[PDB]
Structures are given as C-alpha cells and as structure tokens.
Amino acid sequence: GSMSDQEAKPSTEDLGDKKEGEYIKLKVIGQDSSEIHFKVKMTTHLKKLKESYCQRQGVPMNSLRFLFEGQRIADNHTPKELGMEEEDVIEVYQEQTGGHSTV
C-alpha cells in the first residue's frame, strides 16, 4: 500500500516543486501583434491575470477574446489549466482597439 517498504519517504528523495514565489511567468499576446510577458499570481482562477490585462488594455466582454491551453477558456478553473507555477500562456483575439472618438 506504499511506494516503498517504508511508509514514509525522505524529503530529499522527492524533489517536489520549487517555487520562486506566488507569481508565475504568464504572458498573453493578441492577434494585433501585442506582446505581454510578465508574472502574476495563480492562487485563484486566471481572472486576476487576464482581468488586469483586460481592463488596463481592453475587456474581452466586447472586443478581446482569451485562448489559454488552446481553446476559449473561462475564468473559474484553477486545477484545470491553471496549475502552472512559472510558465502560463494565453492568446487573445481582439476585434477593436478603442478610440477617444464617440464612435
């Protein structure tokens, strides 16, 4: 019922996960040739990473779209594709860039 005869294994035997902090290297880019490489925290869904990205540049609700592992994803799945610690990636498809005009 155990990996070895001993029920407990030494901490050194298991490398474990090395984490520089609660921030990952998450970078999201948009079809408009926009590149965003920076680190965010992954303690909650990926909403915090893209939400700051969406309001500071453009909320996907009307123009931006977020592709994560490869398919359009939501902002409420941590264990799913948000289990990354220092390498997360998202691609966004934007249709409008906004403008100071009334439009």
Question: How far is it, in rounded angstroms, from Cα 44 to Cα 30?
Answer: 23
Collect contacts of 41-44 with beta carbons under 8 A, ≥24 apart. 42/78, 42/82, 42/84, 42/85, 42/88, 44/78
Residues linked to residue 40 through DSSP beta bridges, in sequence order: 24
- The domain spans of the chain are 1-103
Separation CA 73–CA 35 (nearest Å):
19
Contacts of 23 (CB under 8 A, 6+ apart): 39, 40, 41
Three state DSSP letters for 27-70? EEEECCCEEEEEEEECCCCCHHHHHHHHHHHCCCCCCEEEECCC
Read off the DSSP letter of residue 72: B
Nearest-10 Cα torsion for 57, 63, 66, 72: 170
The closest alpha carbon to 51, from 28, 25, 71, belongs to 28
CB count within 10 Å of CB 38 equals 13
The CATH number assigned to the domain with range 1-103 reads 3.10.20.90
Tell me the three state secondary structure of residue 88: strand
N-to-C CA span, the chain? 67
